[PDB]
Design a protein around this ligand. Sequence first.
Ligand SMILES: Nc1nc2c(ncn2[C@@H]2O[C@H](COP(=O)(O)OP(=O)(O)NP(=O)(O)O)[C@@H](O)[C@H]2O)c(=O)[nH]1
Ligand SMILES: Nc1nc2c(ncn2[C@@H]2O[C@H](COP(=O)(O)OP(=O)(O)NP(=O)(O)O)[C@@H](O)[C@H]2O)c(=O)[nH]1
Ligand SMILES: [Mg+2]
Ligand SMILES: [Mg+2]
Lengths: 178, 178, 337, 337
Amino acid sequence: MQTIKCVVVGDGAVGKTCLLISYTTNKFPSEYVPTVFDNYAVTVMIGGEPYTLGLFDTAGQEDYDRLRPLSYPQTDVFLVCFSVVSPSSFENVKEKWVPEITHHCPKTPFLLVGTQIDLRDDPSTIEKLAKNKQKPITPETAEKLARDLKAVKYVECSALTQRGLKNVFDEAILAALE
Amino acid sequence: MQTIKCVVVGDGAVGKTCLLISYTTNKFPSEYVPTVFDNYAVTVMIGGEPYTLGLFDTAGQEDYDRLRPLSYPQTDVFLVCFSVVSPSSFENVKEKWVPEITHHCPKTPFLLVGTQIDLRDDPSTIEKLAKNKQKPITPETAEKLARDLKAVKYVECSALTQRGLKNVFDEAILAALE
Amino acid sequence: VLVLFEQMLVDMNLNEEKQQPLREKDIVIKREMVSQYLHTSSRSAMMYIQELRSGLRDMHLLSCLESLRVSLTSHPVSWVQTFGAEGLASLLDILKRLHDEKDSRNQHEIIRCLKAFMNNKFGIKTMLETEEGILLLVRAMDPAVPNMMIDAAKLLSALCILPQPEDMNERVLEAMTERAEMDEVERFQPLLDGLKSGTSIALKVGCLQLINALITPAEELDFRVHIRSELMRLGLHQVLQELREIENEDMKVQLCVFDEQGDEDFFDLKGRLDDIRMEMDDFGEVFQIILNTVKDSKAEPHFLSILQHLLLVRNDYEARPQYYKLIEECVSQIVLH
Amino acid sequence: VLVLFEQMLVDMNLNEEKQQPLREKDIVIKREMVSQYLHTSSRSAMMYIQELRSGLRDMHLLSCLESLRVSLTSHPVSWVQTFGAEGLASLLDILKRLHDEKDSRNQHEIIRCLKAFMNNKFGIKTMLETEEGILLLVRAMDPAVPNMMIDAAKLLSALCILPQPEDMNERVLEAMTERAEMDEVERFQPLLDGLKSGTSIALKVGCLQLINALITPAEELDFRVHIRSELMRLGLHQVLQELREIENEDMKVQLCVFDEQGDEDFFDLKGRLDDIRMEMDDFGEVFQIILNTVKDSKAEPHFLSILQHLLLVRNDYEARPQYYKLIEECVSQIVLH
Ligand SMILES: Nc1nc2c(ncn2[C@@H]2O[C@H](COP(=O)(O)OP(=O)(O)NP(=O)(O)O)[C@@H](O)[C@H]2O)c(=O)[nH]1
Ligand SMILES: Nc1nc2c(ncn2[C@@H]2O[C@H](COP(=O)(O)OP(=O)(O)NP(=O)(O)O)[C@@H](O)[C@H]2O)c(=O)[nH]1
Ligand SMILES: [Mg+2]
Ligand SMILES: [Mg+2]
């Protein structure tokens, strides 16, 4: 079956699987299970026309670094994820992820996706970061990284509340259709 | 000659002499000369009646600690001075000055006088203090110390600009007249 | 039918644990994987050696290196094979060039390449067979470039742990002597500069890890105390008070390994001192050991110098017993930590 | 006519400089001064001794002490005379009582009294004649109470400077040994706790000042090196790096005095080592000095223990020369700073 192939990458525990489960099933898995690779599929109506989206979930672990590229052939769009409450994952978008997808799929577009956006105003999360001299990534910081790495655009979401979640994938279709 | 005897005490370089020169002569001595003891005199009209004020300038140095008390006999009012840009002098109002005048002249009133008030908003002065983890004394801090040490009230002035200067001595007369 | 799957798993550098969820995927998924594995077999390794020899500089070198790193990380171990010694050699030549000319990003990136190169059997083997490989790793331990140091340190730490070639900790130490004697500095100075307060916790953790990795595999108690007191001399004891404070799970595990080893070594060396104190109870006994054992040795000049240093205080001094009691405490803390 | 003026000036504890502007005031002002001096001669000293013996506690003790301090500061030296030994004794008894019962404000205030008491000839003399005076000053050096420590330290520093009674620095040191051997701690520990980063600059300045004052008057080079290395052992060397940083005019003058003395002492002791190295060029020579000079001495047990500590490393060890070279460096830094 032909689809808009959309591959999802980013550090472990950034929230990729949840983002996929939450979007495609409307449920949030409570338990964490590190993913090797999984396929998902959705249908999105655009102006009364069906558009079919093939969603490839990949491993955030370094141990599957050599396995991941098997998900890459003939990709139409990438989602490069980081958690807005993990400056660590934000940095790896730049040192690891973008150079990785660029290498395997040059000139195929990608979106910068900010995740776990509901925890950006959580005081418990904010203080944990502050103890490490760290702070959440603001939308405006992320938009700056997007322009610098030549991403199509920056989108953000919470998988828990689903805020901004539909938009991620509507924007992914648009990027893949250009 | 009988007068309202007013004695002025406080750390060296707090601005007592200037305060006295500035008030009684309308001039500001540029040069600094540590005072041993000096007398000054002014006439103040209150409701069309002359009131005569005897002003006793004392040494801020510790070296004249045993000389100062000669200024104290039959005092009607004390002015206990500190510079609002010297937290050091503010502390000595409590550890040294008030207990000293109390000892020699119990139950004779005193005013808490904040000096050099023009330097409270001087950025050069503020930063010098901040480098030492210090800050200017705000009027509200000083008013709190006044109530605690049972001063008549807190007054403040700049001798350089003369702002609040007349009021100090009008308030000193009032305290001495009660 | 599943034979090409077996090799794929090995070619993706996965242990038995990480293979497990892949072995459970049905034949249908396995069949699609092997095909997309055969398809993925980007420019070749040959082109990278080409570029590494083509005199790249600053920004243009970095791009190349960033692109090589991805290849070394993401491609099958077999691609790494093709890169091999030849590629490692040219990769190490550039590292040298960079040292010979007054970017730390270029230096850092080669180490990032080296890290990916060495996460597999072949990579470590090939690195070990280099004449200048381990020295260049030691030289990358710049406290001024914390992230590179962490990466160099961690690789270096994994080599000391290696049982397969014997005395890898001595091979690392050897290399640290070599870089010290060209830089004209103490061999353990970078490790200690890394432990100064102000440096990152990750770097602090890295330095103690290497320190531990150098000391752990050493079977000889003299070796352990020897390098430990060389550490102690450069002020390790006091910086160690500082780290005992910072609430980090990774620092506590490294301090823990260090302290446990220092304790066991204390016990042993104290046992040796109790024994010397039983047998050699006066000067005659002790002098005979020095004449038999130290005199006419390579150790003679240094031991003589220690003796001489102990005799600068005058006979007359009314408090020499007290002075010597204090010197004794100092010497004691030096020998027995 | 001006005869009562002369005594007034002496009674107000003023040196020739501070008297000068008062000697220039015309007879008219002088005449009014002597009268108001004769008038000022507040409750008497007798009443204060009364209260100091009357079992005051907490807040009520403080008031009394605050009131005594003013008297001791502001009244003529002759009032201080009336207080005298008797008053000092009872003032020192309370200080002891306070130590014997688990306010640091009451302790601090007695020192503030002591400070005023001692700014005059009579005060210092009377304090020196006490059996427990100088010990109680040393005991007031609590790093937990910084301001009291600064005050105690500064008084203690002025005593070491004193030429008039001989060896005042040794009298202070003696007292510091006495408080160390009741507290069960190192004698110079408070001085070093005061120099830790986190403490005030004023306290840091105070501690170095005392350190300097203990070392400066000492004529014997062995004494200076003796106490300096006792300092060094408790980590003075490393805390000294820290203070070399902080931009304060008062700290720089104290570091400066210390460094200048340590330098001159280094020079001298290095000269002693050059001489020992010329004469005692081998083991036989050196052994004879030990037998003649250390054996059968009070120094024997400690020197023997140092020797024994040097022999824990095995004969077999493949790197003992190197080890002993490292120990030599350590011993050298201990003996020669
Ligand atoms: N509050 C909050 N938590 C989230 C959100 N999305 C994910 N999480 C939490 O983050 C954890 C990891 O999620 P997961 O999707 O498995 O991450 P991953 O990126 O797939 N990891 P891996 O790459 O290793 O499979 C889970 O415990 C989940 O509860 C979100 O939007 N909000
Ligand atoms: N900006 C500013 N400087 C002031 C003010 N009053 C005094 N000064 C400065 O403070 C310094 C000392 O003032 P002075 O009156 O001599 O202090 P003092 O309190 O008499 N000192 P002493 O007790 O030793 O005689 C002078 O250099 C003067 O310029 C003021 O109102 N504003
Ligand atoms: Mg996942
Ligand atoms: Mg004045």
